[PDB]
Amino acid sequence: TVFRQENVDDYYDTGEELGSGQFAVVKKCREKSTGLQYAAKFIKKRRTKSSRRGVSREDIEREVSILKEIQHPNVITLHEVYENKTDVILILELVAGGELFDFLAEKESLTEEEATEFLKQILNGVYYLHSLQIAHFDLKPENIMLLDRNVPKPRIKIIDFGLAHKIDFGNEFKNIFGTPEFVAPEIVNYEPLGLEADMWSIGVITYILLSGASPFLGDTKQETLANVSAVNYEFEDEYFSNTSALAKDFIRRLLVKDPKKRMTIQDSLQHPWIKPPQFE
Ligand SMILES: c1cnc(N2CCN(c3cc(-c4ccncc4)cnn3)CC2)nc1
């Protein structure tokens, strides 16, 4: 599949840089014909078939195909796609209130009510994705953006669909590996992956929201990965002594090694607490 090959600068003016991933740069932009503002994500293409730099065309096309499918309040959406010799340029919905990662660093830790207010929205977005058989595979606070960080109950959108895959057989078996602190044991062990890996990541995010601390983090990436595979985490009294047992129960039912025994997204919404790259 091919994308619009006119120069993106003929249609948009770019501004502030917002983020800078590995093979991607994100800049705020403005469409000339409407005045509306977006985030332009420039993804570097591979320069040869055998090249390690850049993103393969297969991987770019998959990300674009997934983004085109989605429309939900808690997920980023896609406005347009351009390309040239060096980059594919995704014109995405602008989410201007920064990352959940940076919001958390300012608060130290959240109350249970603040945590559930964020978590309910994350769960709603993942329920939508999993309903479409989309596994995100890279859920972490850096990939949760706030629409406006200066309101009592900030609204969020899930971003960064660069690892997302459609799971048409209940599992997939490709080269997929996200950030060590957040990956499930089946990722660490190179086993077939499905929608359950995202539920593990949600358990990690919940632990962090409540404590300010990362449950499996070691001093090196390999140590983190070993901790994940062994389910080597515990609720430290210093952080959790006054956290409700139901919050701990929710986390416990997500941080389960066997993916078949982990809570599904539907389970998580009925849980009583809720119910109303890898190498150094
Ligand atoms: C370490 C450090 N930062 C990160 N980020 C930074 C954020 N990133 C982004 C941001 C956007 C985006 C979309 C719409 N409006 C604003 C921004 C799109 N795509 N990627 C990726 C995750 N990850 C690890």
From Swiss-Prot:
Chain positions recorded as ATP binding sites: 18-26, 41, 93-95, 99, 160
Modifications made to the protein after synthesis: Ubiquitinated by the BCR(KLHL20) E3 ubiquitin ligase complex, leading to its degradation by the proteasome.
Domain Protein kinase: 12-274
Tissue expression notes: Isoform 2 is expressed in normal intestinal tissue as well as in colorectal carcinomas.
Active site positions, chain numbering: 138 (proton acceptor)
Induction remarks: Up-regulated following treatment with IFNG/IFN-gamma.
Recorded superkingdom: Eukaryota
Function: Calcium/calmodulin-dependent serine/threonine kinase involved in multiple cellular signaling pathways that trigger cell survival, apoptosis, and autophagy. Regulates both type I apoptotic and type II autophagic cell deaths signal, depending on the cellular setting. The former is caspase-dependent, while the latter is caspase-independent and is characterized by the accumulation of autophagic vesicles. Phosphorylates PIN1 resulting in inhibition of its catalytic activity, nuclear localization, and cellular function. Phosphorylates TPM1, enhancing stress fiber formation in endothelial cells.
Complex formation: Interacts with KLHL20. Interacts (via death domain) with MAPK1 and MAPK3. Interacts with MAP1B (via N-terminus). Interacts with PRKD1 in an oxidative stress-regulated manner. Interacts with PIN1, PDCD6, BECN1, TSC2 and STX1A. Interacts (via kinase domain) with DAPK3 (via kinase domain). Interacts with GRINB. Interacts (via death domain) with UNC5B (via death domain). Interacts with UNC5C (via death domain).
Family: Belongs to the protein kinase superfamily. CAMK Ser/Thr protein kinase family. DAP kinase subfamily.
Domain notes for this protein: The autoinhibitory domain sterically blocks the substrate peptide-binding site by making both hydrophobic and electrostatic contacts with the kinase core.
Name of this protein: Death-associated protein kinase 1
Organism the protein comes from: Homo sapiens (Human)
Part of the whole protein covered: 2 to 277 of 1430
